[PDB]
Design a protein around this motif. Structure first.
Motif, PDB file in Angstrom:
ATOM      1  N   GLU A  36       0.508  -0.752   0.088  1.00 16.70           N
ATOM      2  CA  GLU A  36      -0.319  -0.135   0.162  1.00 16.70           C
ATOM      3  C   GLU A  36       1.002   0.935  -0.021  1.00 16.70           C
ATOM      4  O   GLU A  36       0.263   2.654  -0.312  1.00 16.70           O
ATOM      5  N   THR A  37       1.759   1.328   1.094  1.00 21.22           N
ATOM      6  CA  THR A  37       3.127   2.220   0.826  1.00 21.22           C
ATOM      7  C   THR A  37       3.896   1.961   0.318  1.00 21.22           C
ATOM      8  O   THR A  37       4.757   1.205   1.072  1.00 21.22           O
ATOM      9  N   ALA A  38       5.126   2.802  -0.223  1.00 22.85           N
ATOM     10  CA  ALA A  38       6.144   1.991  -0.837  1.00 22.85           C
ATOM     11  C   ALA A  38       7.361   3.612  -1.355  1.00 22.85           C
ATOM     12  O   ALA A  38       6.804   4.313  -1.362  1.00 22.85           O
ATOM     13  N   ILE A  39       8.602   3.469  -1.634  1.00 18.69           N
ATOM     14  CA  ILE A  39       9.347   5.002  -2.133  1.00 18.69           C
ATOM     15  C   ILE A  39       9.700   4.079  -2.657  1.00 18.69           C
ATOM     16  O   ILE A  39      10.071   2.617  -2.587  1.00 18.69           O
ATOM     17  N   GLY A  77      10.264   8.351  -6.389  1.00 14.82           N
ATOM     18  CA  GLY A  77       8.217   8.802  -5.823  1.00 14.82           C
ATOM     19  C   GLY A  77       7.864   7.546  -4.920  1.00 14.82           C
ATOM     20  O   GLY A  77       8.709   7.483  -4.024  1.00 14.82           O
ATOM     21  N   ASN A  78       6.728   7.540  -4.841  1.00 12.56           N
ATOM     22  CA  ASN A  78       6.488   6.645  -4.126  1.00 12.56           C
ATOM     23  C   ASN A  78       5.056   5.770  -4.425  1.00 12.56           C
ATOM     24  O   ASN A  78       4.472   6.854  -5.459  1.00 12.56           O
ATOM     25  N   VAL A  79       4.805   5.256  -3.545  1.00 17.71           N
ATOM     26  CA  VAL A  79       2.970   4.852  -3.838  1.00 17.71           C
ATOM     27  C   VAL A  79       2.545   4.582  -2.042  1.00 17.71           C
ATOM     28  O   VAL A  79       3.061   4.654  -1.678  1.00 17.71           O
ATOM     29  N   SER A  80       1.078   5.082  -2.912  1.00 20.03           N
ATOM     30  CA  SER A  80       0.629   4.983  -1.556  1.00 20.03           C
ATOM     31  C   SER A  80      -1.422   4.993  -1.934  1.00 20.03           C
ATOM     32  O   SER A  80      -1.394   4.930  -3.228  1.00 20.03           O
ATOM     33  N   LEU A  81      -2.199   4.435  -1.038  1.00 19.82           N
ATOM     34  CA  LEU A  81      -3.470   4.444  -1.077  1.00 19.82           C
ATOM     35  C   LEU A  81      -3.794   5.723  -2.080  1.00 19.82           C
ATOM     36  O   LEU A  81      -4.383   6.789  -1.091  1.00 19.82           O
ATOM     37  N   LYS A  82      -4.856   5.482  -2.464  1.00 19.86           N
ATOM     38  CA  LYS A  82      -5.644   6.587  -3.244  1.00 19.86           C
ATOM     39  C   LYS A  82      -7.022   5.940  -3.997  1.00 19.86           C
ATOM     40  O   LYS A  82      -6.914   5.298  -5.065  1.00 19.86           O
ATOM     41  N   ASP A  83      -8.134   6.367  -4.103  1.00 18.72           N
ATOM     42  CA  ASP A  83      -9.587   5.299  -4.005  1.00 18.72           C
ATOM     43  C   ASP A  83      -8.956   4.297  -3.990  1.00 18.72           C
ATOM     44  O   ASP A  83      -9.437   3.155  -4.455  1.00 18.72           O
TER      45      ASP A  83
ATOM     46  N   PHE B 117      10.644  11.700   1.706  1.00 13.51           N
ATOM     47  CA  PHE B 117      11.761  10.312   2.467  1.00 13.51           C
ATOM     48  C   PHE B 117      12.370  10.300   2.801  1.00 13.51           C
ATOM     49  O   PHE B 117      13.733  10.984   2.749  1.00 13.51           O
ATOM     50  N   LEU B 118      12.867  10.841   4.376  1.00 14.66           N
ATOM     51  CA  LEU B 118      13.828  10.740   5.321  1.00 14.66           C
ATOM     52  C   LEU B 118      14.026   9.729   5.611  1.00 14.66           C
ATOM     53  O   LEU B 118      12.985   8.822   6.672  1.00 14.66           O
ATOM     54  N   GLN B 119      15.391   8.586   6.420  1.00 15.92           N
ATOM     55  CA  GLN B 119      15.772   7.963   6.524  1.00 15.92           C
ATOM     56  C   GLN B 119      17.041   8.254   7.555  1.00 15.92           C
ATOM     57  O   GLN B 119      17.625   8.330   7.389  1.00 15.92           O
TER      58      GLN B 119
END
Lengths: 143, 143, 143
Positions: A36-39, A77-83, B117-119
């Motif tokens: 659901e969430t990632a970079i 970029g990133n991954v995140s929930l949308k709809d 993003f910060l690690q």
């Protein structure tokens, strides 16, 4: 309350098959894995990439369609929930045959070679929702 | 002795509020969280960003002030101790309305949207100190 | 079977000494540490960097030799086994004195300052082998 803090989930490094559309593949990958969430970060080469520059007054992206092979110098970029579904948001810098760089928001891009790093994050909700800007954004982290 | 090896501390992914100055916010974030060392990456859009190209003979940066909205195609950088406080060093690639890319060291930039993003990294000291170059740098890792 | 999933190994953040050739140093670093697979990111300044744009019809890179100091705006890449040894593949975006950006595959670059982040990955094999394209690539992750 938004804290912005997450734990490190699953970690991946892979080559995307030739001919996939990059954003589509990363979305489908996350659906399969239940991410659901990632970079994300990566490199490679895209063919006929389309990039976007947001026009704030129009609340939409100006889409610039490039042609031919461009070196994918950076994808961040990133991954995140949308709809209800994982949603991929990334920006790219693209190199032409003379080494000049174009870029912006990645609208779409056919993969020749794409070597992607993906780090899942686990924790609190972080969801893209509509805003007055016409962009789907997360709730901000106000200090 | 410098080893360059660290453990993974706290991990974050957040949207910076509209109108913050990006470097300032990341510094203040780290002060609040008690972060001394980290790596950062992000995307978004900055307004009136100032970028720098270092002039070695002059021991200072040439500052190029851009105007208007630029797509923040890449932000890559780090946080480390300098003179007792967390200090943010980053470089950016910025896209204009025609998709041409400018960039360099980030001197300052007003955030429209910034997804960072910060690690955090934990371990040995890694501090920026003055050098003959006129740059504040860490002790190098000599193989 | 390719899964693309790895565990997080050793983590590093370091400054590369002035005068090293960046790709060479990262390779030698990995040899010393016994690192086979990793992801890298970094910033700094390179002198006389050479960048590459792949020519698919010729199965080789067109090499563009730049001169003087360029801001290393982004370095993104990876380390993986090739012919028995760790092998470094990275792309760079480089800023000139007017803030215009060049870039592509990094062929070589002398370090003035280079602040590199390196994250080792542990798991299944991920090796660069010859392909019909004339590129040494990993086995793809087919969904």
């Amino acid at each position: 309350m938004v804290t912005g803090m997450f734990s490190l989930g699953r970690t991946y490094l892979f080559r995307v098959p030739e001919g996939e559309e990059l954003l589509t593949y990363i979305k489908n990958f996350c659906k399969k894995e239940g991410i659901e969430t990632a970079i994300i970060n990566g490199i490679g080469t895209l063919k006929n990439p389309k990039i976007g520059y947001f026009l704030e007054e129009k609340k939409e992206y100006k889409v610039i369609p490039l042609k031919g092979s461009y070196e994918l110098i950076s994808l961040i970029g990133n991954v995140s929930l949308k709809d209800g579904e994982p949603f991929v948001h990334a920006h790219v810098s693209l190199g032409n045959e003379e080494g000049i760089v174009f870029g912006g928001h990645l609208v779409e891009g056919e993969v020749f070679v794409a070597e992607i790093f993906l780090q899942e994050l686990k924790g609190e909700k972080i969801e893209r929702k509509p805003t007055k800007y016409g962009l789907a954004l997360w709730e901000e982290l106000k200090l």
